[PDB]
Design a protein around this ligand. Structure first.
Ligand SMILES: Cc1c(-c2cc(Nc3cc4n(n3)CCN(C)C4)c(=O)[nH]n2)ccc(F)c1NC(=O)c1cc2ccccc2s1
Length: 265
């Protein structure tokens, strides 16, 4: 793993707080914009992360937010990642909702699908794919962030499927019932993400609690077609929600589907 020298980092702005604590905007060697997670003590399974971190850094794709390196020779540990000036996709959708053309929404889906096809090809699971875990750069390109980090979280409210922080609304039945994660559970989450994009950042299953969502999706309830989604687009997101995991498409198939819709428009 790339062990970055913390002396080369200059902190510039606070970017808020997440599951591992504070995140800052800064520069590396006075030139390159980076985001820096300062890992709060007790928030992460640190030895496990350090042992496994190289796999994450070796993931390289234009539509993945890069994990550049880490600083682990002191505490707190730092994770250094690609800076994205427009922040998370969820807030971006909500803040600009009167400015998007449908072509732009499809392009966001394409960006994410390309990243996920790459992760699939590396047999690497995201485990918490959602609009809140995608970021947007200064040119409006969407990239997938925080892939694989779910595994290292120490917070029972997040890791328990009945915890109030578990991403129930992005989870297929086999995750909720058996904790069976696979690229097919990432597929399900991607469908929900497509729904978030086309609804311009609405909360999935709003007004339902997490347990009500679980109960009802297990019985067949599915997210309705957003107004801005054509039937072709809805068919794509809906295909992600087959009850049986082996009936769900791969990200390669989804990408082909999305490209077909683009070529038709
Ligand atoms: C990714 C991120 C940023 C962030 C924000 C960026 N960009 C921007 C740009 C702006 N903002 N964020 C907010 C303020 N805006 C004015 C500009 C960026 O480039 N990288 N990271 C800032 C605060 C955060 F809380 C997070 N998310 C996390 O750390 C985590 C997500 C997950 C998911 C699963 C498991 C563990 C974790 S830990």
């Amino acid at each position: 793993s790339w062990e970055i020298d913390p002396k080369d980092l200059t902190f510039l702005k606070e970017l808020g707080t997440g599951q591992f604590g504070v995140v800052k905007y800064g520069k590396w060697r006075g030139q390159y914009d980076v985001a820096i997670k300062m890992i709060k003590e007790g928030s992460m399974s640190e030895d496990e992360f350090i042992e496994e971190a190289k796999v994450m850094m070796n993931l390289s794709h234009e539509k993945l937010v890069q994990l550049y390196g880490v600083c682990t020779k002191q505490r707190p540990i730092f994770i250094i990642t690609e800076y994205m000036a427009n922040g998370c996709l969820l807030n971006y959708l909500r803040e600009m909702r009167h400015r998007f053309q449908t072509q732009q929404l499809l392009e966001m889906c394409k960006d994410v699908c390309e990243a996920m096809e790459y992760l699939e090809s590396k047999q690497f699971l995201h485990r918490d794919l959602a609009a809140r875990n995608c970021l947007v750069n200064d040119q409006g390109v969407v990239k997938v962030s925080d892939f694989g980090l779910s595994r290292y979280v120490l917070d029972d409210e997040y890791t328990s499927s009945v915890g109030s922080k578990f991403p129930v609304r992005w989870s297929p039945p086999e995750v909720l019932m058996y904790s069976k994660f696979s690229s097919k559970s990432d597929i399900w989450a991607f469908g929900v993400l497509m729904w978030e994009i086309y609804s311009l950042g609405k909360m999935p299953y709003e007004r339902f609690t997490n347990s009500e969502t679980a109960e009802h999706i297990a019985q067949g309830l599915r997210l309705y077609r957003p107004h801005l989604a054509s039937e072709k687009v809805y068919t794509i997101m809906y295909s992600c929600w087959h009850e049986k995991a082996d009936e769900r498409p791969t990200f390669k198939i989804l990408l082909s589907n999305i490209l077909d819709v683009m070529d038709e428009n």
